Amino acid sequence: FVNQHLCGSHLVEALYLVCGERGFFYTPKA
Amino acid sequence: FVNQHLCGSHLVEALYLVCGERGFFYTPKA
Amino acid sequence: HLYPGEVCPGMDIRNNLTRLHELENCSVIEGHLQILLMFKTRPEDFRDLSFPKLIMITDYLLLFRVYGLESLKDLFPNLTVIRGSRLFFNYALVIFEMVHLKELGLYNLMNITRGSVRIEKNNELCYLATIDWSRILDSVEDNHIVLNKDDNEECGDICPGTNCPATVINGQFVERCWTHSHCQKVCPTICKSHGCTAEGLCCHSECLGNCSQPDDPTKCVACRNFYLDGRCVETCPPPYYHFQDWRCVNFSFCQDLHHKCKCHQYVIHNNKCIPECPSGYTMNSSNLLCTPCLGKVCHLLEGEKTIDSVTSAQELRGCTVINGSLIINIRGGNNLAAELEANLGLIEEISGYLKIRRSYALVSLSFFRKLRLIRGETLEIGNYSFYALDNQNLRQLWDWSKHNLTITQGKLFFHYNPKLCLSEIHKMEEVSGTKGRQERNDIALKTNGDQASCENELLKFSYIRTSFDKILLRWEPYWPPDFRDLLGFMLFYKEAPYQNVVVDIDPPLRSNDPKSQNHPGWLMRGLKPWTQYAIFVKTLVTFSDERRTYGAKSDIIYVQTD
Amino acid sequence: HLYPGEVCPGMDIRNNLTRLHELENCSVIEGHLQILLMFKTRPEDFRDLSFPKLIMITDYLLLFRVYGLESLKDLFPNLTVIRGSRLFFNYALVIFEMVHLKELGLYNLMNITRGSVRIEKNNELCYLATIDWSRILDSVEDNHIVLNKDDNEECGDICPGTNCPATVINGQFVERCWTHSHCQKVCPTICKSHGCTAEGLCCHSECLGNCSQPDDPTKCVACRNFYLDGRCVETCPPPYYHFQDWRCVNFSFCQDLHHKCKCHQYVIHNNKCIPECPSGYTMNSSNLLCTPCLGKVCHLLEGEKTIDSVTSAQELRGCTVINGSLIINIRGGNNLAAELEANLGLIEEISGYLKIRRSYALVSLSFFRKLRLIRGETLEIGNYSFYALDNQNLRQLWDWSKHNLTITQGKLFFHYNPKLCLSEIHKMEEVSGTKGRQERNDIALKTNGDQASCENELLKFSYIRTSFDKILLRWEPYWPPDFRDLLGFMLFYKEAPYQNVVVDIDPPLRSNDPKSQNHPGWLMRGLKPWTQYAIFVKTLVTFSDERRTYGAKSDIIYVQTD
Amino acid sequence: QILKELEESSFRKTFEDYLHNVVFVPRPSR
Amino acid sequence: QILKELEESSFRKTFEDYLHNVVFVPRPSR
Amino acid sequence: GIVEQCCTSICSLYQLENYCN
Amino acid sequence: GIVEQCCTSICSLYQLENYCN
Numbered sequence A, B: 001f002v003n004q005h006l007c008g009s010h011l012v013e014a015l016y017l018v019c020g021e022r023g024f025f026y027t028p029k030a
Numbered sequence C, D: 001h002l003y004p005g006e007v008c009p010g011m012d013i014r015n016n017l018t019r020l021h022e023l024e025n026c027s028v029i030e031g032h033l034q035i036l037l038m039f040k041t042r043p044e045d046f047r048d049l050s051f052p053k054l055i056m057i058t059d060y061l062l063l064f065r066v067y068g069l070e071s072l073k074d075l076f077p078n079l080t081v082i083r084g085s086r087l088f089f090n091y092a093l094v095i096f097e098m099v100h101l102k103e104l105g106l107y108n109l110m111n112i113t114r115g116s117v118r119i120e121k122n123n124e125l126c127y128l129a130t131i132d133w134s135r136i137l138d139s140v141e142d143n144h145i146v147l148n149k150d151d152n153e154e155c156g157d158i159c160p161g162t163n164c165p166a167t168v169i170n171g172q173f174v175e176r177c178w179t180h181s182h183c184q185k186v187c188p189t190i191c192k193s194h195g196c197t198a199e200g201l202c203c204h205s206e207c208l209g210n211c212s213q214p215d216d217p218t219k220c221v222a223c224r225n226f227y228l229d230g231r232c233v234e235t236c237p238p239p240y241y242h243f244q245d246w247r248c249v250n251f252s253f254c255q256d257l258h259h260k261c262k263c264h265q266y267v268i269h270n271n272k273c274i275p276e277c278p279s280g281y282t283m284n285s286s287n288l289l290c291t292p293c294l295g296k297v298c299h300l301l302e303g304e305k306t307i308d309s310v311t312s313a314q315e316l317r318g319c320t321v322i323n324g325s326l327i328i329n330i331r332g333g334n335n336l337a338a339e340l341e342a343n344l345g346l347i348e349e350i351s352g353y354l355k356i357r358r359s360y361a362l363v364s365l366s367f368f369r370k371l372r373l374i375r376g377e378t379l380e381i382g383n384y385s386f387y388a389l390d391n392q393n394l395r396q397l398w399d400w401s402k403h404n405l406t407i408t409q410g411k412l413f414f415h416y417n418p419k420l421c422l423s424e425i426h427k428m429e430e431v432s433g434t435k436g437r438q439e440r441n442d443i444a445l446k447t448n449g450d451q452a453s454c455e456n457e458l459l460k461f462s463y464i465r466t467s468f469d470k471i472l473l474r475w476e477p478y479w480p481p482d483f484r485d486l487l488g489f490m491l492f493y494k495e496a497p498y499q500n501v502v503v504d505i506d507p508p509l510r511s512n513d514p515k516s517q518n519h520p521g522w523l524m525r526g527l528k529p530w531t532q533y534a535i536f537v538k539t540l541v542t543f544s545d546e547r548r549t550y551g552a553k554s555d556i557i558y559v560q561t562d
Numbered sequence E, F: 001q002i003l004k005e006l007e008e009s010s011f012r013k014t015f016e017d018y019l020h021n022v023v024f025v026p027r028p029s030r
Numbered sequence G, H: 001g002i003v004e005q006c007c008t009s010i011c012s013l014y015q016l017e018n019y020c021n
């Protein structure tokens, strides 16, 4: 696990490596 | 009498025109 | 007819194409559509996938990091009109970070009403120079295109022959197309608003972009303004009501919409089904009508909102009282000011402070129209009710002729405002009436307005001597109250065949002024005959840390030689 | 003998020559001499007026706006030596605003010990280029000459033939004289300190400038150091005591001097009659001896003193405790720092604050030697115990290796310090131990140290490729914690035959670092064979308002081609 | 003189920020 | 760049100040 | 928001576990 | 001092009468 400040596609790839499966929905109200 | 801010030789000539005679001594102590 | 499908209000699809079949039948989506973040997709996952039903989208469209996809010609062959109420940093079309996306093929797109288009980080996309945005959009100067496969000039984005219009724009004929097959359609110079048909006849005066038959409100494709039941209409006849700037609904519709938050409960005013009433107005239990009364507080989250675009702006549309503080911060590049004005502060009060930081293109503040009062009950840290920094084009704050300003507490804070001269700053101090508060270095007395000589003092030319090769000017010798502070005379000259708008001169000896024979001049040699010149002179004096004597400048004048 | 006249301590003459006969007989004036402000004088008022008796003046000499006078050759034909203890803005000779003064004729002047000469606003004076100041003074670079009759080049300041030494200085032989008659005397390159006689033999090792006989302490003209009764002496033998750096006096003299303030009552220490004792010392009722004891407060006027020159400085000579505040303000042009150091703060405490404003040539603060403590019991307005502004050469504050600093109250305040990088500022915060006080904009985070890249980060070159016409460098790709902030690479190159010391490069794609194949480079073409070059690279990154990631730079290196 | 490009880079950065700020919290609701 | 002359003018001004400041008050003692 | 945690600070795996479902 | 009265302010004839004797 890196201990480093992140932006951009680096942060995108980090998020994808953390999530893997479903990860994130879009129901704030419905 | 001028009503104006003064420096330099203007102020020198103004001082000379005011003083005329003796005007100014140099005895702070003696 | 004209819209056989349905509405299907905007929902966004993630991580696989499984939820996409929720949005099949629908003709015009109210709201917005985002497709994002599908890494595990294949190019085969789109050949069995198409939606011709969708024609118009209200607000915006977004594409973001979905793999395997190379085109859009199958997914959206018939999308035509983007209205753009809710925008996206003054955009409605987001083409961004799409690996393998190499073409668009969006030929049926005709008009995008409000907003712009931003394309970035798409190292496969081509066919971009063949797209005349001015046919589709108005402000083409707000479209940002970079980091693309076109940016390494490789793609031969051609079509075999004639068909596609080869239109000169900048240097020569630009062939206009979407694919190597699909040309870019051009309507003639008279069918421009409502669109044209195939042979080029004008459509009906309520059509928009495309029409199935020339001059037929019953046989358009997309409405210009409003839709009512197979006929695009200019307005709602009674008993119908405008809704979201595209249709006419009866009282029962918007009536029963209210009964479902028991979230945007709705009301009716000016024959328009609307979210809320502005100030001085009332609900109605009978019919939800904005009836006037005696006596709108847009209470923020945490008393604070960064404002940077129209998307930030329209949350404060129509507000009157802001129970919070505002941070204006547009790292921009384009004047949003008119669109900024049209949905902003029809207000008087700010409960907290105001802050303006590092914004670039804000030349003015006049878009604040009705603004009068700053409560400042929560100050900026450092005890300020106001702020400015790094405003590379801000010159005018207001005209203080009619504009007023009342400030309760706090102080002012100006730094690095290189076209904001101190005169209007002290005027704002005067109109604010809080001049007995500002300490030293609440005003940066070295950076504010240091790119144009402004303040008050004016040179006037006494005598003018000319020739075919000589220019001699004479002007009144100005002297600041410290005559030692005068250093020399900055002179600026050039030629000007129009009238639509460097040497230095030592000061002469002051020594008196009953007869101060010290009218300064400069002889010019660099003259052309019969030639209009433009000359103006500025006073170059010593800076002082106190209230410095502002120094003078001359008028730009015009002199023609022999 | 050697001084047949008297002392006549310094008094100054105004408005007419009536008081001038008070200063006739005297051989060497202790103190200073000013002649000023005589408008109603005539040129005839000086032909019957001469004083050959005066030979040496201790402190300084000043001439200011006396009319009718054209020369000085009759008034002071034999003035020879100016010692300069009490100076006048680091001058001792003030030739200024003298209408009709056209020559000096000061040939008998030989050495001015300490100080400089300033000549200004004297539109009659000539014979100025014929004056080698380096014979008379040491630091010729502190002599300011402007606004003179020489400044409109007219005067033929010549002598008829040979005599006057025609010495090359800058371009060619400069004939050296005072009048058209009086040459400028040059002693040879061995009699330099004590002076020479007429034929050119060296004087005695206690003479100075002139001697009546070669190698005779009983037949000098002016003493080098000290005078005792016809013999210039190296020091006082007992029972004699040094007084004002020129003589030897007995115990009775400086004894009875004390008995006359019943103003500078005197004491004796180190065989020197002196004004006062420094700290830890005591008076003596027996002999006024600075005897040590257990446990010097220079209490100012209004707790405040502008310090701008040596004349300001020597009022604080030898002080230990300053019961007030200090404003350092040298609008200068010349480093006073050594002379500043030699009479300054052998101290530890300042009761009030410290302020440094708009000083130019102060490159350091190390002349503050023993300084430890700032009480700050009276703050600078705005609650500061410290200040800085507009210091165009200030780089180092101190070496914090041995130098310490203790601050009780108040805050720091830095603005427009363009060669003062923030590293030592934060170090001073650390050593001060008052880091939990400074608010925002107590440090100007845009102007401080913005003329040289300073802080910490260092580029290192990995690979170097050369040719006769190719230069390729490789270096480690640095990335700040926001990798978007990197904008490009500033590269600085030139040739250098000595070693006594422009292109830009886009950043490559970061994208990873297991194998970040992104070592950046630049190919050079502009090469000469066999040619030593000098190259260094700097990181050009985005500014941020927070604690910005400082960015790197490379070493200056040296590369010779084929 | 050319500092508008220097802000334009930061404009690109802010645009990069906003989309990630959209992507980030629709998921933590617990 | 050439601002050292711009301060040098003020240096001349300060020198003009100091001599006048010497000349001014040895006279008012009343 | 996002850069407040993964750029201003550094995120953890546990902080981004909230950005798993 | 001097510029504090005749430059910063403006002197009077009465103020400079102190600079007469």
Ligand SMILES: *[C@@H]1O[C@H](CO)[C@@H](O[C@@H]2O[C@H](CO)[C@@H](O[C@@H]3O[C@H](CO)[C@@H](O)[C@H](O)[C@@H]3O)[C@H](O)[C@H]2NC(C)=O)[C@H](O)[C@H]1NC(C)=O
Residues within 6 Å of the ligand: C111, C112, C113, C134, C135, C136, C137, C138, C192, C193, C224
């Ligand atoms: C795309 O279709 C529209 C439909 O008319 C074309 O006209 C534009 O229509 C909008 C809405 O009627 C106009 O905006 C309006 O501006 C006024 C201020 O002038 C404002 O008060 C309203 O609230 C509304 O925002 C817009 O001005 C108008 N533009 C033009 C040039 O007529 C639009 O031109 C079509 N696009 C193209 C590229 O042809």
Ligand SMILES: *[C@@H]1O[C@H](CO)[C@@H](O[C@@H]2O[C@H](CO)[C@@H](O[C@@H]3O[C@H](CO)[C@@H](O)[C@H](O)[C@@H]3O)[C@H](O)[C@H]2NC(C)=O)[C@H](O)[C@H]1NC(C)=O
Residues within 6 Å of the ligand: D111, D112, D113, D134, D135, D136, D137, D138, D192, D193, D224
């Ligand atoms: C004019 O005469 C003097 C007499 O010796 C020549 O020498 C200078 O003498 C002074 C006083 O002895 C020296 O100043 C001293 O400097 C030391 C530091 O080095 C300091 O600790 C003392 O307190 C004192 O200030 C000065 O350095 C010395 N200069 C030289 C070059 O020897 C002087 O040279 C004569 N002028 C000319 C132009 O020949």
Ligand SMILES: *[C@@H]1O[C@H](CO[C@@H]2O[C@@H](C)[C@@H](O)[C@@H](O)[C@@H]2O)[C@@H](O[C@@H]2O[C@H](CO)[C@@H](O)[C@H](O)[C@H]2NC(C)=O)[C@H](O)[C@H]1NC(C)=O
Residues within 6 Å of the ligand: C021, C022, C023, C024, C025
């Ligand atoms: C898209 O439309 C088809 C066609 O059916 C129409 O839409 C239905 C929702 C309903 O209103 C029908 O009367 C319309 O004719 C839908 O397919 C139908 O789905 C329903 C279940 O919802 C099923 O009972 C029918 O047998 C289906 N008919 C056919 C011809 O397939 C489909 O569900 C719609 N998709 C979405 C997402 O709404």
Ligand SMILES: *[C@@H]1O[C@H](CO[C@@H]2O[C@@H](C)[C@@H](O)[C@@H](O)[C@@H]2O)[C@@H](O[C@@H]2O[C@H](CO)[C@@H](O)[C@H](O)[C@H]2NC(C)=O)[C@H](O)[C@H]1NC(C)=O
Residues within 6 Å of the ligand: C229, C250, C251, C252, C253
């Ligand atoms: C008042 O309006 C409602 C809703 O209008 C329907 O939806 C609109 C978006 C538009 O598509 C209209 O053409 C629709 O009629 C009416 O309720 C619907 O009426 C139609 C009659 O053809 C019927 O087929 C629908 O099932 C009805 N909807 C529901 C949910 O039952 C209503 O009839 C209108 N009343 C009057 C007096 O005009």
Ligand SMILES: *[C@@H]1O[C@H](CO[C@@H]2O[C@@H](C)[C@@H](O)[C@@H](O)[C@@H]2O)[C@@H](O[C@@H]2O[C@H](CO)[C@@H](O)[C@H](O)[C@H]2NC(C)=O)[C@H](O)[C@H]1NC(C)=O
Residues within 6 Å of the ligand: D021, D022, D023, D024, D025
């Ligand atoms: C300058 O010196 C002359 C010469 O006299 C010497 O100085 C005197 C002060 C005194 O000490 C004499 O013994 C010295 O020989 C002075 O002229 C004399 O003045 C005194 C009055 O002070 C008078 O009694 C003498 O007769 C004068 N003698 C002569 C020959 O003129 C003169 O006063 C001195 N000037 C000053 C300002 O001290």
Ligand SMILES: *[C@@H]1O[C@H](CO[C@@H]2O[C@@H](C)[C@@H](O)[C@@H](O)[C@@H]2O)[C@@H](O[C@@H]2O[C@H](CO)[C@@H](O)[C@H](O)[C@H]2NC(C)=O)[C@H](O)[C@H]1NC(C)=O
Residues within 6 Å of the ligand: D229, D250, D251, D252, D253
């Ligand atoms: C102690 O010194 C005093 C003062 O010395 C005199 O002044 C000096 C500046 C220098 O010029 C010395 O040569 C002087 O002697 C002596 O008092 C004077 O002594 C001389 C003796 O020749 C006499 O002519 C003076 O009138 C005396 N001064 C006064 C005011 O009367 C004193 O004699 C010395 N004592 C010893 C023991 O040496």
Ligand SMILES: *[C@@H]1O[C@H](CO)[C@@H](O[C@@H]2O[C@H](CO)[C@@H](O)[C@H](O)[C@H]2NC(C)=O)[C@H](O)[C@H]1NC(C)=O
Residues within 6 Å of the ligand: C382, C383
């Ligand atoms: C800014 O001004 C306010 C107003 O005086 C200061 O806040 C006061 O602080 C004192 C003690 O800290 C409290 O007793 C008052 O109630 C506070 N008043 C308000 C209105 O907050 C504050 O200290 C000042 N801050 C700075 C940095 O100057």
Ligand SMILES: *[C@@H]1O[C@H](CO)[C@@H](O[C@@H]2O[C@H](CO)[C@@H](O)[C@H](O)[C@H]2NC(C)=O)[C@H](O)[C@H]1NC(C)=O
Residues within 6 Å of the ligand: D382, D383
């Ligand atoms: C600077 O700080 C001092 C310390 O708090 C402030 O002075 C105090 O003012 C209050 C009321 O005005 C008095 O009761 C205290 O006795 C004062 N203390 C001292 C040490 O003077 C002062 O107001 C502050 N000034 C600014 C501009 O912030």
Ligand SMILES: *[C@@H]1O[C@H](CO[C@@H]2O[C@@H](C)[C@@H](O)[C@@H](O)[C@@H]2O)[C@@H](O)[C@H](O)[C@H]1NC(C)=O
Residues within 6 Å of the ligand: C372, C401, C402, C403, C404
């Ligand atoms: C805001 O300003 C309006 C216009 O001001 C009027 O015209 C200027 C030239 C002044 O003479 C001003 O006194 C006039 O009133 C006013 O109509 C309005 O009352 C002002 N509002 C407040 C709260 O001051």
Ligand SMILES: *[C@@H]1O[C@H](CO[C@@H]2O[C@@H](C)[C@@H](O)[C@@H](O)[C@@H]2O)[C@@H](O)[C@H](O)[C@H]1NC(C)=O
Residues within 6 Å of the ligand: D372, D401, D402, D403, D404
């Ligand atoms: C001032 O500093 C003197 C030297 O400091 C010594 O050396 C440095 C490297 C540090 O290790 C420091 O702790 C040492 O004391 C001291 O001799 C002196 O005591 C200091 N004075 C005060 C008041 O701190």
Ligand SMILES: *[C@@H]1O[C@H](CO)[C@@H](O)[C@H](O)[C@H]1NC(C)=O
Residues within 6 Å of the ligand: A022, C014, C015, C016, C018
């Ligand atoms: C599609 O995504 C949803 C949510 O991420 C998930 O429930 C479903 O199993 C996925 N389907 C496939 C075929 O991956």
Ligand SMILES: *[C@@H]1O[C@H](CO)[C@@H](O)[C@H](O)[C@H]1NC(C)=O
Residues within 6 Å of the ligand: B022, D014, D015, D016, D018
């Ligand atoms: C010279 O000046 C003094 C004081 O200013 C005065 O006493 C004396 O009368 C003056 N003499 C002449 C001739 O002006």
